[PDB]
Design a protein around this nucleic acid. Structure first.
Lengths: 213, 213
DNA sequence: TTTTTT
């Protein structure tokens, strides 16, 4: 799917990426580049197939965080990503797994279009670059590096979310997950079990605690 | 409701009770007093209105602990209590909020009879004593005192279960809970949020670990 | 909750 986006490049690579082994040398952008100056950047990422429960609270988290002046960072994926990003508009930054001349995934075109229009989309890839396994992983590192705090509402084991979670730990980005029932959201519960993430037991509280930092 | 139980008195107060600031001077009993010598005593207490979710896992916890030679201690209450006790039979000990000549709650009369027959029921009250606000809270301290570990599958804030959690902490009895969604079990989630309880993220590993010590 | 619990 063609985006018909009119895109350029960032003048400067955000310093957040300096922590990376191989920081992007060039970033392509469409939308509000000033969002990159937001004091509080929060990643919300997770399963492409969230339960009604997780969706419900992903919406509250995104809306309230954006209401309090934070910007939500995600990857525009089906499920958790695109729920969080739509509900954070216009304060949201998407890192694309393809060049900005392409829309991916196709079914998210309306929201992604709105992000291009009122938020910000960034890509490491210049043109005619279709999503490929390595680019999904590559952009995942950018979501984590750019973000100050990482929220994973719901996630399975051995998922991309879990890889991103390990990146968050590597870079000491505070990691929070939604409380989840047994034998569901296995990935996030393992994070809780191993003390690698904190649970969000009260959304308004959680947010005020982030703000007071 | 009269029980028509034939009951006696324990020859003396079990040692576990001597931690209490006001230990029972006498305990009345019906059933198999040999259960008091079981190495591992585990309390399973909680809301009188468990979700299907909490119910299914309470059943597994109770059965598997019994299989592993543990005795399940509870108060024979509607909901979590009686589910665990019935599934722990015959290895279960009930602490009654009333004298043993009465059945409470009446809806549990069938299982309570089975506990008197094949398990053990204890009471601090000799006779003609119906349950009262004070006797539930008194009973709770005996559940906590007798038990080595306390599992609270699901509970509301400011509840009898929470009262028991407070006693568990006071008398250095380790707490454990089931993972619960946001706004379904505020009581147990608060325990998790304050690090006052540990979550059960795998029932089989939970049990094995208990056996280790 | 009348059918009982910080």
């Amino acid at each position: 799917m063609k985006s018909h986006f009119q895109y350029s490049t960032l003048e400067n690579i955000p310093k957040a990426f300096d922590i990376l082994k191989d920081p992007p040398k060039k970033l392509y952008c469409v939308g509000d580049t000033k969002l990159l100056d937001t004091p509080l950047k929060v990643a919300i990422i997770g399963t492409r197939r969230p339960t009604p429960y997780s969706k419900q609270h992903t919406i509250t988290l995104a809306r309230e965080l954006a209401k309090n002046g934070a910007v939500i960072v995600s990857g525009g994926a089906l499920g958790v990503d695109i729920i969080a990003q739509e509900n954070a508009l216009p304060k949201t930054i998407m890192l694309s797994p393809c060049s900005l001349d392409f829309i991916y995934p196709t079914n998210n075109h309306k929201v992604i279009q709105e992000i291009a229009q009122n938020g910000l989309i960034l890509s490491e890839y210049e043109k005619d670059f279709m999503p490929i396994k390595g680019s999904f992983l590559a952009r995942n590192r950018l979501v984590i590096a750019l973000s100050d705090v990482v929220i994973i509402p719901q996630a399975d084991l051995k998922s991309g979310s879990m890889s991103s979670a390990r990146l968050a730990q590597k870079y000491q980005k505070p990691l929070f997950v939604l409380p989840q029932r047994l034998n569901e959201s296995d990935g996030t519960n393992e994070l809780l079990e191993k003390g690698q993430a904190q649970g969000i037991f009260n959304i308004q509280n959680f947010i005020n605690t982030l703000l007071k930092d």
